[PDB]
Scaffold this active site. Structure first.
Site, PDB file in Angstrom:
ATOM      1  N   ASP A  35     -10.389  -9.017  -1.085  1.00  0.00           N
ATOM      2  CA  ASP A  35      -9.003  -8.483  -1.100  1.00  0.00           C
ATOM      3  C   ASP A  35      -9.284  -6.863  -1.270  1.00  0.00           C
ATOM      4  O   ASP A  35      -9.363  -6.483  -2.475  1.00  0.00           O
ATOM      5  CB  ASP A  35      -8.225  -8.891  -2.059  1.00  0.00           C
ATOM      6  N   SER A 199      -2.058   6.506   9.374  1.00  0.00           N
ATOM      7  CA  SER A 199      -2.166   6.465  10.870  1.00  0.00           C
ATOM      8  C   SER A 199      -1.733   7.440  11.713  1.00  0.00           C
ATOM      9  O   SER A 199      -0.530   8.195  11.040  1.00  0.00           O
ATOM     10  CB  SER A 199      -1.720   5.077  11.170  1.00  0.00           C
TER      11      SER A 199
HETATM   12  C1  LIG Z   1       5.818  -6.216  -2.970  1.00  0.00           C
HETATM   13  C2  LIG Z   1       5.366  -5.121  -3.091  1.00  0.00           C
HETATM   14  C3  LIG Z   1       4.446  -3.747  -3.531  1.00  0.00           C
HETATM   15  N1  LIG Z   1       3.032  -3.895  -3.579  1.00  0.00           N
HETATM   16  C4  LIG Z   1       2.511  -4.771  -4.745  1.00  0.00           C
HETATM   17  C5  LIG Z   1       2.520  -4.676  -2.390  1.00  0.00           C
HETATM   18  C6  LIG Z   1       0.819  -4.834  -2.475  1.00  0.00           C
HETATM   19  N2  LIG Z   1       0.495  -5.902  -2.589  1.00  0.00           N
HETATM   20  C7  LIG Z   1      -0.765  -6.094  -2.422  1.00  0.00           C
HETATM   21  C8  LIG Z   1      -1.682  -7.502  -2.746  1.00  0.00           C
HETATM   22  O1  LIG Z   1      -1.478  -7.907  -4.058  1.00  0.00           O
HETATM   23  C9  LIG Z   1      -3.049  -7.308  -2.431  1.00  0.00           C
HETATM   24  N3  LIG Z   1      -3.566  -7.473  -1.400  1.00  0.00           N
HETATM   25  C10 LIG Z   1      -2.864  -8.597  -0.752  1.00  0.00           C
HETATM   26  C11 LIG Z   1      -3.201  -9.893  -1.310  1.00  0.00           C
HETATM   27  N4  LIG Z   1      -2.485 -11.078  -1.315  1.00  0.00           N
HETATM   28  C12 LIG Z   1      -3.268 -12.157  -1.488  1.00  0.00           C
HETATM   29  C13 LIG Z   1      -2.917 -13.509  -1.714  1.00  0.00           C
HETATM   30  C14 LIG Z   1      -3.993 -14.370  -1.058  1.00  0.00           C
HETATM   31  C15 LIG Z   1      -3.546 -15.695  -1.376  1.00  0.00           C
HETATM   32  C16 LIG Z   1      -2.360 -16.035  -1.798  1.00  0.00           C
HETATM   33  C17 LIG Z   1      -1.388 -15.448  -2.240  1.00  0.00           C
HETATM   34  C18 LIG Z   1      -1.561 -13.943  -2.234  1.00  0.00           C
HETATM   35  N5  LIG Z   1      -0.832 -13.069  -2.608  1.00  0.00           N
HETATM   36  N6  LIG Z   1      -4.596 -11.900  -1.719  1.00  0.00           N
HETATM   37  O2  LIG Z   1      -4.344 -10.371  -1.762  1.00  0.00           O
HETATM   38  C19 LIG Z   1      -1.476  -8.442  -1.687  1.00  0.00           C
HETATM   39  C20 LIG Z   1      -1.682  -4.647  -2.391  1.00  0.00           C
HETATM   40  S1  LIG Z   1      -0.262  -3.583  -2.114  1.00  0.00           S
END
Ligand SMILES: C#CCN(C)Cc1nc([C@]2(O)CN[C@@H](c3nc(-c4ccccc4N)no3)C2)cs1
Length: 330
Positions: A35, A199
């Site tokens: 991730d 981008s």
């Molecule tokens: C709303 C809002 C504001 N802000 C927090 C958005 C962002 N979110 C991220 C992440 O948390 C990190 N990259 C993504 C991720 N998702 C999962 C996942 C895998 C399996 C099952 C469930 C999951 N969530 N694994 O990594 C989500 C980065 S910026």
């Protein structure tokens, strides 16, 4: 040093990708979701509440001769979709595709939310964003990449995600056979802890290019491509019958449609996402309404170049003193 590991979609939709990771001595192999949007390495474990484990492979630190409790350390994380997990922390030897880090913080889950319990194929996450986002308290911990960086031949890792097919994460080197043309590198801001870049614009299908700055993150842990509502509306306007559904939670389109491609700019270069990559299939089994792979970021607060975008490219995460991101067609 270098490492290379194959990453495999968990399902027919490429909802997420799992990569085998060796933890402890003797090795306990868990399939982790790499991730680039978070910075914790956490695992289902012998400490996870039993009712919250449903088929995952668990890490048992008591069976690892190299595991050490990181005394007093806890962690707790909530992801963009509301999913969450928490627990305590061990240090142990972690290897990915031949690349070994000793003393890596392995965050053992005591609790996981329902989405993780339901994903029987995901044994945990391996965060590859910047270590400033790591949730371990009271002593923040470094990611696997951060720990390995000084030992690598080059302080880089690359994501080469497949479309309905396996792909590759490489650490420490650029596989020059894995992409076509040249890699276009673009500046990264680490101010929010992400691989955040801008981008240069977009095009829909065969249309001309719209030059416009789109600040977003390269996030292998997010399934879809989340872009400003203006851009997303311009895309779905080209698909007869496509509309945003509040009940479904995003843009849906008739499964009978053939989707246009979507191009995003990286500097003066262009990455073309084929239309088929934007099809996430029926919203429920047998439905003729299909879920779109490009969705609005309006409720998120940040644009996310998730797997839909990244799997159209060979992506270099350059962790040099001034980090950059590289994108090549493939
Ligand atoms: C709303 C809002 C504001 N802000 C927090 C958005 C962002 N979110 C991220 C992440 O948390 C990190 N990259 C993504 C991720 N998702 C999962 C996942 C895998 C399996 C099952 C469930 C999951 N969530 N694994 O990594 C989500 C980065 S910026």
């Amino acid at each position: 040093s270098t490492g290379s590991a194959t990453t495999t979609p968990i399902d027919s939709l490429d909802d997420a990708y799992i990569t085998p990771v060796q933890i402890g001595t003797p090795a306990q192999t868990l399939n982790l979701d790499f991730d680039t949007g978070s910075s914790d390495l956490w695992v289902f474990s012998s400490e996870t509440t039993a009712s919250e484990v449903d088929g995952q492979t668990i890490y048992t630190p008591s069976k690892s001769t190299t595991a050490k409790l990181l005394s007093g350390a806890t962690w707790s994380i909530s992801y963009g979709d509301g999913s969450s997990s928490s627990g305590d922390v061990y240090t142990d030897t972690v290897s990915v595709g031949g690349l070994t880090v000793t003393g890596q913080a392995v965050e053992s889950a005591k609790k996981v939310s329902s989405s993780f319990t339901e994903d029987s194929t995901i044994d945990g996450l391996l965060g590859l964003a910047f270590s400033t986002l790591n949730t371990v308290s009271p002593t923040q911990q470094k990611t696997f990449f951060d720990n390995a960086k000084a030992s690598l031949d080059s302080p880089v890792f690359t994501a080469d995600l497949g479309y309905h097919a396996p792909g590759t994460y490489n650490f420490g080197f650029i596989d020059t056979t894995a992409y076509t043309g040249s890699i276009t590198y673009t500046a990264v801001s680490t101010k929010q802890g992400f691989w955040e870049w801008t981008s240069t614009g977009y095009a829909v299908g065969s249309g001309t290019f719209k030059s416009t700055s789109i600040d977003g993150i390269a996030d292998t842990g997010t399934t879809l491509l989340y872009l400003p509502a203006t851009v997303v509306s311009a895309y779905w306007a080209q698909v007869s019958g496509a509309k945003s559904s509040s009940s479904v939670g995003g843009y849906v389109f008739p499964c009978s449609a053939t989707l246009p491609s979507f191009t995003f700019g990286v500097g003066s270069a262009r990455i073309v996402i084929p239309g088929d990559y934007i099809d996430f299939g029926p919203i429920s089994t047998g439905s003729s309404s299909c879920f779109g792979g490009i969705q609005s970021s309006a409720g998120i607060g940040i644009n996310i170049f998730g797997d839909v975008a990244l799997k159209a490219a060979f992506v270099v995460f350059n962790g040099a003193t001034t980090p950059t991101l590289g994108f090549a067609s493939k």
